[PDB]
């Protein structure tokens, strides 16, 4: 996957897939789905579905929610209050054992991030009266830091893969809906049909 601040964005449309098979499996640790009840995903039809994927630490799953606090929820990825989306998160401890030291996350920013903002940039963060230039030092810091994902750590340090699904409902066309099932046929009997 990608970094948390450079979260990966995917656009899916023009397909038919079953959303029920996701929560049916027991391998999904966290499923907080605010937009609609889990069993109604297949019932309703949507458009141009968007998926945002990243990796967070163990004890920050509560940060990913519409309209709450959090350092990651403020400088890395923030959900607007009017967000009828759906959130899945699952452990990936066995996929980063030694541990992994290639993960970066924003820690310092002037203000909170905008909704669905792909803010990619690098700069020496300054927090002092004196201007910051040249080499880093006092009041001149790097806003990106690594993760302590040691293979001998418990909850709070185990990497978690987090995906957020969002959508727009019937802007004008319809491309992706829930699957439909069909039964067998009968003959020589007065039947009410729905062909």
């Amino acid at each position: 996957f990608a970094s948390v601040y450079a979260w990966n964005r995917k656009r899916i449309s023009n397909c038919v897939a079953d959303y029920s098979v996701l929560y049916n499996s027991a391998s999904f640790s966290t499923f907080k789905c605010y937009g609609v009840s889990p069993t109604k995903l297949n019932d309703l039809c949507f458009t141009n579905v968007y998926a945002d994927s990243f990796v967070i630490r163990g004890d920050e799953v509560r940060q990913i929610a519409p309209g709450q606090t959090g350092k990651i929820a403020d400088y890395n990825y923030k959900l607007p209050d009017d967000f009828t989306g759906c959130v899945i998160a699952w452990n990936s401890n066995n996929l980063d054992s030694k541990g992994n030291y290639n993960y970066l996350y924003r820690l310092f920013r002037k203000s909170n991030l905008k909704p669905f903002e792909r803010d990619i940039s690098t700069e020496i963060y300054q927090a002092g009266s004196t201007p910051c230039n040249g080499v880093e030092g006092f009041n001149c810091y790097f806003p990106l830091q690594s993760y302590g994902f040691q293979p001998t750590n418990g909850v709070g340090y185990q990497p978690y893969r987090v995906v957020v699904l969002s959508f727009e409902l019937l802007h004008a066309p319809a491309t992706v809906c829930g699957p439909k099932k069909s039964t067998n046929l009968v003959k020589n009997k007065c039947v009410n049909f729905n062909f």
Partner: antibody, heavy 120, light 108 residues
Framework: EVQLQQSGPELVKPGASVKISCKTS????????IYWVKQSLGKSLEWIGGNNPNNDDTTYKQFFKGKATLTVDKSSSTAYMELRSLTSEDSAVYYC?????????????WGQGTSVTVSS | DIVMTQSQKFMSTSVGDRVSVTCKSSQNVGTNVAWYQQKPGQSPKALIY???YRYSGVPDHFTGSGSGTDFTLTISNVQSADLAEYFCQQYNNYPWTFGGGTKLEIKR
């Protein structure tokens, strides 16, 4: 809503260690750094140094060796300075100040200062 | 290197004449200064920011200067509460160091 209460006058002995406390209350302490300066009875102002409450950073001037030490705590929300080698001329007043990053750079708020006098 | 003299240590104005003090600095390092008033006994009070701005909490009637490696400040007049010390500021490098200060005396 910014205020600063410091300690009173102190009498020190050469070749000893003393402590001076700068207390900050009524406002957030995590973001803005804390600066320390001296006044030797109306002479030129010397920037003793500065410290960062968040990163626990420490910065001195060009010539400060001898008592170069900084310390802060959030439970008491204050700062402690340790003075050593009070040989012959350190009798002066210490001033503890706080700056503002969004506005009012360069030591907007000051304190009453603590006067330390060296004697036998 | 690091030196601040502002070409004077103390200046005297008797009555009515406008007061102006420079803050000539060292070679080009930047453009950021300040001026503080030091009353005889209590904490310094900030007078001007970067030699040309205004203070919300101070009845500011002041005249400043431009930019570059030289700075100047002009105050309204010599009131009855102007006898104090004048301190200039220079915050570019971490080893902060100010000048010797300026003293305003009412020449009776």
């Amino acid at each position: 809503e910014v205020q600063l209460q410091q300690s009173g006058p102190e009498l020190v002995k050469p070749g000893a260690s003393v402590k001076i406390s700068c207390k900050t209350s009524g406002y957030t302490f995590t973001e803005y750094t804390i600066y320390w300066v001296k006044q030797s009875l109306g002479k030129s102002l010397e920037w003793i140094g500065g410290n960062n409450p968040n990163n626990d950073d420490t910065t001195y001037k060009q010539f400060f060796k001898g008592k170069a030490t900084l310390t802060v705590d959030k439970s008491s929300s204050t700062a402690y300075m340790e003075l050593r080698s009070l040989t012959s001329e350190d009798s002066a007043v210490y001033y503890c100040a706080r700056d503002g990053y969004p506005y009012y750079y360069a030591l907007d708020f000051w304190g009453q200062g603590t006067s330390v006098t060296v004697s036998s | 290197d690091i030196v601040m003299t502002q070409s004077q240590k103390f200046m005297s104005t008797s009555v009515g004449d406008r007061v102006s003090v420079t803050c000539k600095s060292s070679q080009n390092v930047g453009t950021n200064v300040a001026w503080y008033q030091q009353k005889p006994g209590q904490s310094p009070k900030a007078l001007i920011y970067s030699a040309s701005y205004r203070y919300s909490g101070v009845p500011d009637h002041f005249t400043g200067s431009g930019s570059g490696t030289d700075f100047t400040l002009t105050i309204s007049n010599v009131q009855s509460a102007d006898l104090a010390e004048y301190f200039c500021q220079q915050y570019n490098n971490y080893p902060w160091t100010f000048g010797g200060g300026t003293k305003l005396e009412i020449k009776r």
